[PDB]
Symmetry: C3
Subunit: 114 residues, 3 copies
Amino acid sequence: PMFIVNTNVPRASVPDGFLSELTQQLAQATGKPPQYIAVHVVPDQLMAFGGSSEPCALCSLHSIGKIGGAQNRSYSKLLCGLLAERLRISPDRVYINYYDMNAANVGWNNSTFA
Amino acid sequence: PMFIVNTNVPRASVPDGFLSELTQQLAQATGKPPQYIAVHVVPDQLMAFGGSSEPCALCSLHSIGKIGGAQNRSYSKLLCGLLAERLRISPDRVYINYYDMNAANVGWNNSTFA
Amino acid sequence: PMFIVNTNVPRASVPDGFLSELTQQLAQATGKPPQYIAVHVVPDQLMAFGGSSEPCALCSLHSIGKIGGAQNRSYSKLLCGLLAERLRISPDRVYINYYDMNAANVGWNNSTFA
Ligand SMILES: CC(C)c1nn2ccccc2c1C(=O)[C@@H](C)N
Ligand SMILES: [Cl-]
Ligand SMILES: [Cl-]
Ligand SMILES: [Cl-]
Ligand SMILES: [Cl-]
Ligand SMILES: [Cl-]
Ligand SMILES: [Cl-]
Ligand SMILES: [Cl-]
Ligand SMILES: [Cl-]
Ligand SMILES: [Cl-]
Ligand SMILES: [Cl-]
């Protein structure tokens, strides 16, 4: 799986250990092996949500399977929870796009998961 | 909806009110409330379009519905128009990927839109 | 086509002409004219792969057609090879998401490719 978070929150406000916490929480939530988890955080971004530039975040979670109605609601609660707790971003100022990737469309180690 | 613009144009060349203009114009174009419109601009990028690093832009517009053949053509005219006017980027050096998202695949406020 | 590389490797480590090499290599691989190839490299990113902060990369390749099982395996070998030789990133620490875009969903020059 791959989780990306883009936010206008400054770098200095992203607490130490955030990438590790995301990796650990996502491994368990998705059920995927920790070695399969990739995380990416992009702070200090120029963005707005509803026209307001108060703290907000635009994210994406890509996974081969483990994507669905119920699972996505659970990931959203988990992720919005972490963003609220660690980056002080209100859950209603966070969007998370979920993508269920076909194995044939994910490259890794000179090949694909197909 | 969510609109992201990645460009090699420097931050100082992004005029005041750009995020606000995009928010307003996209709310009107998509027919969605501006409160639900998120915009993100990423300047000073290392990119090339067609083998040259002259001003260019790689963008994405995600929306639950309001995506289609005719609508996308209309959005492209609007967006390329804004990028040319405000960032001086030639329309033929702009790519905009459109994504019609299923409500279950868009997280927000500890849940999804499903 | 559009190729994006997000990586934690330093900007100073990205060889000059790297964008040009990616452009020409992708033009050859996809069979499409270099004029239509866009490349984007984002260094100095805060990311982790498998919980580790060692060099890694999260990439995407979007193309109208020329995407598939066999082709993607070929693209992965090509791209991982380039990232390894030029950016010193191990292939097993690289993810590449492939997207076969419908022409109606790719905006360009005030319209779409449909
Ligand atoms: C699905 C499988 C190919 C696979 N994907 N993947 C992604 C990141 C790290 C390890 C692996 C991995 C493996 O364990 C191989 C060695 N069997
Ligand atoms: Cl589910
Ligand atoms: Cl897919
Ligand atoms: Cl602005
Ligand atoms: Cl140039
Ligand atoms: Cl339409
Ligand atoms: Cl039309
Ligand atoms: Cl979707
Ligand atoms: Cl194929
Ligand atoms: Cl093959
Ligand atoms: Cl598409």
